[PDB]
Amino acid sequence: NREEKILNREIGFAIGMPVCEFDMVKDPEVQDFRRNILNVCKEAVDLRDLNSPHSRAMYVYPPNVESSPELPKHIYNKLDKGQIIVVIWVIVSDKQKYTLKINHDCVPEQVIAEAIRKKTRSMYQGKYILKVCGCDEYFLEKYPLSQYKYIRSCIMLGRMPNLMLMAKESLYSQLPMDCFTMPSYSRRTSTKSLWVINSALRIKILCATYVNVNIIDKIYVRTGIYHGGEPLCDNVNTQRVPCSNPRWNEWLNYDIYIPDLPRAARLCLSICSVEEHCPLAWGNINLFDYTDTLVSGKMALNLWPVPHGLEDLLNPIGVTGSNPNKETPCLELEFDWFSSVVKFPDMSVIEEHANWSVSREAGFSYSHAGLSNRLARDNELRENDKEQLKAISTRDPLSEITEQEKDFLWSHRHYCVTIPEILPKLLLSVKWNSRDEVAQMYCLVKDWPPIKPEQAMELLDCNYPDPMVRGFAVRCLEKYLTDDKLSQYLIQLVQVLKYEQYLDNLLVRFLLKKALTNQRIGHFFFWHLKSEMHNKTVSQRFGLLLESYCRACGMYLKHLNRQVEAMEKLINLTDILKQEKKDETQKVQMKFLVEQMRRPDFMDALQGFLSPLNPAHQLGNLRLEECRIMSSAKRPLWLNWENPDIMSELLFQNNEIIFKNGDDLRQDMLTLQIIRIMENIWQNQGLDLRMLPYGCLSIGDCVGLIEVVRNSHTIMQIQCKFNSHTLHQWLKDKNKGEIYDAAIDLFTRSCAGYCVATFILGIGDRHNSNIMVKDDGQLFHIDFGHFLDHKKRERVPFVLTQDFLIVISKGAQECTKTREFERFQEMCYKAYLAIRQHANLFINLFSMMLGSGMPELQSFDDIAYIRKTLALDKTEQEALEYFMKQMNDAHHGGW
Ligand SMILES: C[C@H](Nc1ccc2c(c1)OCCn1cc(N3C(=O)OC[C@H]3C(F)F)nc1-2)C(N)=O
């Protein structure tokens, strides 16, 4: 138990709260979560000690690979007859290099043998491993060399891959053997079915405590029964009462039969003032608990404050459950009593019912089917009907499905199985207050054909609360989501956890198992959860989840605790500079910083740890002379560490990170993720528009890290050394001679990609201080704090000034009327249309981010902006015409 107390101290330090605080939670759901999740921990630890030491090394250093070994035409043609030049370094005392020309699809074992052949010609194979020079990135698995992200990046950038031969035992001996230990908490009327209760739904509103307002006058409680965002019946209000005495003692009757209540049904309520009706406090509750039990008896629900922007009286897409703060409006509710415990029926009872319904419908006469548009006969399915179904399935997730299409999709639900990507539309067409239809939907979902992971992700958002539906989505992720794509969408998958009704669910088990079997996923999983630990709407869920992750991640908890301590020291320093030294000069502030940083406690916490931006990067000794307070808003810290890697000169000798305390970095994180997804779509279609999605990580409440791009300057820094020719002059000066055209091409291409990306996403206004350019000519944007409809009718955030057109047109006077400008336009058109073709992906990435309290992403109407910029109701020619007009009005001619 001495080991357990010390480990509980480590977990507490990592999570930010003491582990004893969980042990004090009375809630049986919380205690069952802590216990039951431990089998995911056990399965994951078993997988790691399955083929030791290799399986342990694969967990710690997973291959950083692309999803497909297939190289796009433009990328493959960058190779010399499908061959790549590679540099293999061998440490012999001294550093010896061996240059190899090998096929791109060579396995690391082939590369090692070719390297030993060259070393022998200068005068075993499975006793070595290839490492990337400069970082802790290893090639432990037998993939084609070009499938590794490092190599694919080298081919695309005309770079020389620098690999190092390392002895397997030099790596194996450095990987500590941890033993996962099961914690102390591992060792812990009648019952009737819901479908047997021949009664209507009723709930009693008793009274409200902690209703502190400005004597606001007459108040009432507004209630509704919801299934996700869909109302199951009409909303029921209490009688008006004075705020000075909030007492109702009233039963509210709902237009819903208790056996008709879906599994994920919720009571959505709010205390409203009044005619200008205004919500004061809101709260949501699950009608069934985690044990599938219908709510009974008395219950007190602590309510939440109204979000600035919500004018709606109820808030169904808000969080479910009581507010952890007990010094808030507290509404007492009483539920019905049935002289027994009521449970939702099990699968077998639901299947018997669905099979009974299917069989009964199959015997319906022509005239019976004619009574309802939701009933149709098997043989009466024409080729036109099948065409309309296929057409409906191509519509985007924000396209309204009329009541007629809903009846139509439901009556052809069996044909829908042949076009399985229609499932999200079919699910929104279901009568969720009819147990006959819901039971039939379950049986269709149970056996539904698998869909694409990016299509299944939609089924995990706020629109699909049903656990059978969510379980299907998770099964598609388990079978088809690669570790590369999981890493890419980890922020959306962590966000949708908030939409799970219960702590113990299929999604959380899938995510935890992946985090515990891949340290690269585990790292970002920990940081996305930890960064939101201040938010009291998810701190219990994320804290318990972090507790379970920290018990089984092994040795990585110790490395995480170094990054947590380094970040805390930096949060403490920046907090002092903004509260006690804000009005002092840069020199005075830098003197204060240098002194504080040099303290023994601080100095050691800020050196010798892994970059939270990229844990393959080691941060050694902090280089204090290169550290500075930046002139930008919130005055970020420019930080520089030595790369302690022996071959640091072959990658970067100093790792420079911007530490910023003051701004929400979540919108920046999402924009950068989208830019990368856009670039990925463009490269795959043979459209080389190189984007620069630099690293950005939120590490707490308005705190985070930004990856510094080396050899980059703002437009202002360029022109401050002014003519419109200054930018073109600088580029021509940085790329003198034969390499001039490559810079112009790179500028034009990066420029086209940023015009299209920023116009689609509606990014904040571009100016000279937030547009940067690398020496080689690569243009990129920084500071993505604003997106979508952030004003109140569509904007062009990136208006190409004379400066940009002069570069594009190679110094010509009439830049608007050149062949270079026409080709720049064609690049924009192609780019715009390609994104239009993947609209569902983008819409779903944003929809999964709605529970995240981001100011510009609160409703589906905020996401609707992307439907306008991508012109989705219009045809492809009309969408191109619309893009050209937006550009023309912004530029006052040219398009
Ligand atoms: C030498 C120095 N180099 C530099 C500066 C800022 C960023 C950068 C490189 O890399 C690109 C990523 N980046 C992103 C940001 N920022 C951002 O996103 O918001 C404001 C600003 C920073 F002050 F935080 N700044 C940089 C320079 N040009 O003064």
d(CA 345, CA 354): 13
Instruction: Measure 642 CA to ligand 1 centroid, in angstroms.
Output: 19
Helices 467-480/506-515 angle, 10° precision: 30
Q: Pull the structure tokens for residue 478.
A: 């388990």
**Quick one: CA dihedral 290, 292, 297, 299, positive or negative?**
positive
- Listing DSSP states for 157-217 in one string gives HT---EEEEEEHHHHHTTS--------GGG----EEEGGG---EEEEEEEEEE--------
Instruction: Measure 629 CA to ligand 1 centroid, in angstroms.
Output: 12
d(CA 109, CA 143): 10
Is residue 658 lining ligand 1, measured as CB closer than 6 Å?
yes
Cβ 232 vs Cβ 265: under 8 Å: yes
Residue 661 located in a structural domain: yes
Atom of ligand 1 lying closest to residue 632 CA: 23
Residue nearest to ligand 1 atom 15, measured at CA: 782
Q: Strand pairing partners for 207?
A: 247
- For 330, the 3-state DSSP assignment is strand
Q: Strand pairing partners for 707?
A: 657
Q: Which one-letter DSSP state was computed for residue 421?
A: G
Based on the fold, state whether residues 481 and 586 are members of the same structural domain. no
Residue nearest to ligand 1 atom 25, measured at CA: 782
Torsion from C-alpha of 817, 818, 824, 830, nearest 10 degrees = 80
Residue 147 located in a structural domain: no
Residue 72 located in a structural domain: no
Residue nearest to ligand 1 atom 21, measured at CA: 783
Q: Pull the structure tokens for residue 164.
A: 């190092």
Residue nearest to ligand 1 atom 29, measured at CA: 713
Atom of ligand 1 lying closest to residue 630 CA: 23
Based on the fold, state whether residues 797 and 810 are members of the same structural domain. yes
User: Quick count: other Cβ atoms within 10 Å of Cβ 877?
Assistant: 8
d(CA 435, CA 431): 8
Is residue 786 lining ligand 1, measured as CB closer than 6 Å?
no
- Which residue among 325, 343, 361 closes a domain? 343
d(CA 164, CA 108): 11
Instruction: Measure 889 CA to ligand 1 centroid, in angstroms.
Output: 31
Based on the fold, state whether residues 713 and 817 are members of the same structural domain. yes
Which residues fall within 8 angstroms of residue 783, CB to CB, at 6 or more apart? 668, 764, 770
Of the candidates 546, 540, 507, 503, the residue with the CA atom closest to the CA atom of residue 523? 546
Residue nearest to ligand 1 atom 27, measured at CA: 713
Residue nearest to ligand 1 atom 14, measured at CA: 782
Is residue 393 lining ligand 1, measured as CB closer than 6 Å?
no
Instruction: Measure 494 CA to ligand 1 centroid, in angstroms.
Output: 28
Residue 389 located in a structural domain: yes
Instruction: Measure 707 CA to ligand 1 centroid, in angstroms.
Output: 8
How many angstroms separate the Cα of 870 from the Cα of each of 451, 476, 492, 673, 894?
25, 28, 22, 18, 21
Residue 3 located in a structural domain: no
Provide the residue type at 691 as one letter. Answer: M
Residue nearest to ligand 1 atom 23, measured at CA: 632
- Which residue among 284, 309, 343 closes a domain? 343
Indicate the pairing of strand 218-227 with strand 230-231. antiparallel
Based on the fold, state whether residues 358 and 458 are members of the same structural domain. yes
d(CA 50, CA 55): 6
**Quick one: CA dihedral 414, 420, 423, 425, positive or negative?**
negative
Based on the fold, state whether residues 549 and 560 are members of the same structural domain. no
d(CA 752, CA 755): 5
Instruction: Measure 120 CA to ligand 1 centroid, in angstroms.
Output: 47
Count how many domains the chain has.
Answer: 4
Is residue 603 lining ligand 1, measured as CB closer than 6 Å?
no
d(CA 633, CA 537): 29
User: Residue 713: what are its φ and ψ, rounded to 5°?
Assistant: -145, 150
Is residue 694 lining ligand 1, measured as CB closer than 6 Å?
yes
Residue 23 located in a structural domain: no
- State the first-to-last Cα distance of the chain, in angstroms, to the nearest integer: 73
Instruction: Measure 62 CA to ligand 1 centroid, in angstroms.
Output: 30
Based on the fold, state whether residues 242 and 380 are members of the same structural domain. no
Based on the fold, state whether residues 530 and 576 are members of the same structural domain. no
Instruction: Measure 817 CA to ligand 1 centroid, in angstroms.
Output: 34
Residue 48 located in a structural domain: no
User: Quick count: other Cβ atoms within 10 Å of Cβ 677?
Assistant: 19
Ligand 1 pocket, mutate which of 782, 784, 786 (most atoms under 8 A from CB): 782
Q: 166-182 burial, b if ≥16 CB within 10 A, otherwise e?
A: beeeebeeebeebebee
Cβ 33 vs Cβ 503: under 8 Å: yes
User: Quick count: other Cβ atoms within 10 Å of Cβ 101?
Assistant: 11
User: Residue 122: what are its φ and ψ, rounded to 5°?
Assistant: -70, -10
- Which residue among 672, 700, 728 closes a domain? 700
Residue nearest to ligand 1 atom 28, measured at CA: 713
Instruction: Measure 326 CA to ligand 1 centroid, in angstroms.
Output: 43
Is residue 511 lining ligand 1, measured as CB closer than 6 Å?
no
Q: Which one-letter DSSP state was computed for residue 413?
A: H
Q: Strand pairing partners for 138?
A: 131
CA angle 740, 743, 747 (to 5 degrees): 145
Instruction: Measure 696 CA to ligand 1 centroid, in angstroms.
Output: 11
Of the candidates 772, 728, 765, the residue with the CA atom closest to the CA atom of residue 750? 772
**Left, alpha or beta for 521 (phi > 0: left; psi -120 to 50: alpha)?**
alpha
Of the candidates 81, 71, 63, the residue with the CA atom closest to the CA atom of residue 143? 63
Residue nearest to ligand 1 atom 3, measured at CA: 712
Atom of ligand 1 lying closest to residue 663 CA: 19
d(CA 723, CA 119): 56
Instruction: Measure 782 CA to ligand 1 centroid, in angstroms.
Output: 7
Instruction: Measure 708 CA to ligand 1 centroid, in angstroms.
Output: 6
- Listing DSSP states for 702-766 in one string gives TEEEEEPPTTEEEHHHHHT---TTHHHHHHHHHT-GGGHHHHHHHHHHHHHHHHHHHHHHT-S--
Burial class (CB in 10 A: 0-12, 13-18, 19+), 528: buried
Based on the fold, state whether residues 550 and 493 are members of the same structural domain. yes
Cβ 639 vs Cβ 658: under 8 Å: yes
Q: Pull the structure tokens for residue 751.
A: 């420029």
Is residue 782 lining ligand 1, measured as CB closer than 6 Å?
yes
Ligand 1 pocket, mutate which of 640, 712, 780, 784 (most atoms under 8 A from CB): 712
Which residues fall within 8 angstroms of residue 160, CB to CB, at 6 or more apart? 85, 86, 87, 154
User: Residue 865: what are its φ and ψ, rounded to 5°?
Assistant: -55, -35
Residue nearest to ligand 1 atom 19, measured at CA: 783
Starting at the edge strand found earlier in the chain, the sheet holding 628-629 runs 628-629, 637-642, 654-661, 703-707, 696-700
Is residue 717 lining ligand 1, measured as CB closer than 6 Å?
yes
Residue 74 located in a structural domain: no
Rg of the chain in Å (alpha carbons): 30
Give the distance from CA 621 to its chain's centroid.
Answer: 32
Is residue 783 lining ligand 1, measured as CB closer than 6 Å?
yes
Q: What approach was used to elucidate this structure?
A: X-ray
Is residue 708 lining ligand 1, measured as CB closer than 6 Å?
yes
Of the candidates 750, 791, 790, 759, the residue with the CA atom closest to the CA atom of residue 871? 759
Atom of ligand 1 lying closest to residue 658 CA: 24
Residue nearest to ligand 1 atom 17, measured at CA: 783
Is residue 706 lining ligand 1, measured as CB closer than 6 Å?
yes
Cβ 640 vs Cβ 623: under 8 Å: yes
User: Quick count: other Cβ atoms within 10 Å of Cβ 504?
Assistant: 16
User: Residue 199: what are its φ and ψ, rounded to 5°?
Assistant: -150, 150
Based on the fold, state whether residues 373 and 517 are members of the same structural domain. yes
Cβ 5 vs Cβ 533: under 8 Å: no
Based on the fold, state whether residues 532 and 572 are members of the same structural domain. no
Q: Pull the structure tokens for residue 449.
A: 């054909």
Is residue 764 lining ligand 1, measured as CB closer than 6 Å?
no
Instruction: Measure 135 CA to ligand 1 centroid, in angstroms.
Output: 23
User: Quick count: other Cβ atoms within 10 Å of Cβ 801?
Assistant: 15
Is residue 709 lining ligand 1, measured as CB closer than 6 Å?
yes
Based on the fold, state whether residues 629 and 708 are members of the same structural domain. no
- For 88, the 3-state DSSP assignment is strand
Indicate the pairing of strand 162-167 with strand 83-91. parallel
Q: Which one-letter DSSP state was computed for residue 625?
A: G
Indicate the pairing of strand 341-343 with strand 191-193. parallel
Torsion from C-alpha of 349, 355, 356, 362, nearest 10 degrees = 170
Is residue 780 lining ligand 1, measured as CB closer than 6 Å?
no
H-state helical runs in 502-612? 506-515, 519-530, 539-552, 556-579, 586-597, 600-605
Of the candidates 549, 495, 496, the residue with the CA atom closest to the CA atom of residue 519? 549
Instruction: Measure 771 CA to ligand 1 centroid, in angstroms.
Output: 10
Of the candidates 294, 272, 64, the residue with the CA atom closest to the CA atom of residue 193? 294
CA angle 198, 202, 208 (to 5 degrees): 160
Is residue 716 lining ligand 1, measured as CB closer than 6 Å?
no
Cβ 460 vs Cβ 473: under 8 Å: yes
Q: 598-609 burial, b if ≥16 CB within 10 A, otherwise e?
A: eeeebeebbbeb
Residue 354 belongs to domain spanning:
347-555
d(CA 496, CA 847): 10
Instruction: Measure 664 CA to ligand 1 centroid, in angstroms.
Output: 16
Q: Which one-letter DSSP state was computed for residue 153?
A: H
Based on the fold, state whether residues 309 and 397 are members of the same structural domain. no
